């Protein structure tokens, strides 16, 4: 996360830290979002290089990546579902969404606490406008040109950018379609970054913090005319419901 501030997971209690097992402690790989006690949504691109549930561990309730966190919950991936139409195209990802059914070694799903909460899926449509300032959070880089990653959780505020704006040639042109969600800072000073992918785009809709997008791609981080691009979750509601319901 570029800009914003460091924060504890109580401000992002749905945030899921997704790691890969090593042959040797696991390596942090992607963010994710708890959308029901047993299910985590994230980006399919996080799993392509090794698409086996066995090789991943999910932690809820973490403010500091790769160390123990009070109130942590460690989960195995019982089921790994990647979108059937996932695709890469040399610039960007498409259909970039994954589901992870999580379970501890003792069989449990997430137990709600101050640090572990589900986040609401978006409504089918809603009448009544909401604000287009949405939160982003994760463990990604603090600048596109940083080597090294911050280790503690950050969060920030970006604003949704219309598809029509995001498809301008100065922006991403024809690479943006109706399934994507762009978000940027009007002054280009805060953005998601490398290592934030899979994490949530939280908008406030009908009073609910709401998972509106999943970090998918973006040219650099906080670059002018280059929004962060997000999987438009609302588009996949019936995909999601038909797998987790």
């Amino acid at each position: 996360i570029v800009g914003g501030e460091f924060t504890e997971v109580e401000n992002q209690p749905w945030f899921a830290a997704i790691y890969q097992k090593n042959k040797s402690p696991p390596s942090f790989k992607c963010g994710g979002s708890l959308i029901s006690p047993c299910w985590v949504a994230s980006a399919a691109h996080c799993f392509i290089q090794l698409p086996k549930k066995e090789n991943y561990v999910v932690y809820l309730g973490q403010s500091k990546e790769s160390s123990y966190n009070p109130g942590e919950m460690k989960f195995e991936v019982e089921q790994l579902i990647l979108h059937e139409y996932y695709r890469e195209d040399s610039l960007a990802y498409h259909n970039d969404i994954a589901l992870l059914k999580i379970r501890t070694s003792t069989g449990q799903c997430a137990q709600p606490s101050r640090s572990i909460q589900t986040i609401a899926l978006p409504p089918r449509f809603t009448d009544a406008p909401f604000g287009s300032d949405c939160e982003i959070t994760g463990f990604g880089k603090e600048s596109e040109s940083d080597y090294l990653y911050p280790k503690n959780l950050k969060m920030s505020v970006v604003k949704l950018v219309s598809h029509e704006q995001c498809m301008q040639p100065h922006y991403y042109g024809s690479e943006i379609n109706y399934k994507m969600l762009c978000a940027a800072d009007p002054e280009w000073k805060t953005d998601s970054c490398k290592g934030d992918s899979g994490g949530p785009l939280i908008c406030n809709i009908e009073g609910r913090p709401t998972l509106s997008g999943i970090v998918s791609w973006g040219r650099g981080c906080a670059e002018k005319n280059k929004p962060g691009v997000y999987t438009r979750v609302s588009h996949f509601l019936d995909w999601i419901q038909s797998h987790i319901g």
Binding site: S90, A92, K194, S197, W217
Partner: peptide, 10 residues
């Protein structure tokens, strides 16, 4: 890896 990935492994 597509050119605009934000993935830790890209």
């Amino acid at each position: 890896c597509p050119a605009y990935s934000r993935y830790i492994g890209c």
